[PDB]
């Protein structure tokens, strides 16, 4: 029994902290503000059953932003391949990646 | 009499004055004769990191003025 007294009386007791895309002090954006905004605007009013399957690309992008599991997997694959290449001497890291060139300001 | 306590108080005064002076002098020595820059906030740290790159010698204390441009 979700007695939604907040929506009835118009009070805002806890809906201000339910999402990171809501208003935050000094307009400090969330790390995944864009993805959550897209997911919420996609899945607004169509119901939970439709939102699960229809706005699934947006939710997948949001999850990837939140956890970076696939990005970390790609980076780990790159690191492993680079280590394997270095072991066999098939690759030489560039000087800007070896701390030899001054990074741009 | 009571002034006989003064030598010990003076020794303790010297022992407590050493830390402060030492810290200030070490900060000046390791920051090019200037106060060690504080980085209470990320903006100050970003300024410090940019200054380090601008210096070219990987030290933030050395500052490049109008002579560096053009």
């Amino acid at each position: 029994p979700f007695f939604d007294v907040q929506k009835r009386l118009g009070l805002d007791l806890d809906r201000w902290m339910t999402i990171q895309s809501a208003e935050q002090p000094h307009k400090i954006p969330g790390r995944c503000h864009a993805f959550e905004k897209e997911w919420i605007e996609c899945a607004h009013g169509i119901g939970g059953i439709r939102a699960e399957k229809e706005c699934k690309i947006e939710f997948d992008d949001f999850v990837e932003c939140l956890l970076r599991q696939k990005t970390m997997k790609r980076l780990s694959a790159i690191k492993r391949q680079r280590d394997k290449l270095i072991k066999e001497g098939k690759y030489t890291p560039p000087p800007h990646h070896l701390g030899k060139e001054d990074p741009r300001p | 009499m009571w002034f006989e306590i003064l030598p010990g108080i003076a020794v303790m005064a010297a022992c407590l004055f050493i830390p402060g002076m030492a810290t200030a002098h070490i900060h000046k020595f390791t920051n090019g004769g200037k106060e060690k820059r504080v980085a209470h906030f990320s903006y100050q740290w970003n300024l410090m990191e940019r200054d380090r790159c601008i210096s070219g010698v990987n030290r933030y204390h050395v500052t490049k003025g109008l002579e560096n441009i053009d």
């Binding site: 300001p105 | 300024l47 601008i54 500052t63 490049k64 003025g65 560096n68 441009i69």
Partner: peptide, 22 residues
């Protein structure tokens, strides 16, 4: 998905403002 388009090294070269924060 797709390939992230990235500008080339040449087209992001500017005469840097090589002054200090102070």
């Amino acid at each position: 998905p797709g390939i992230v388009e990235l500008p080339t090294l040449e087209d992001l070269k500017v005469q840097e403002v090589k002054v200090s924060s102070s």
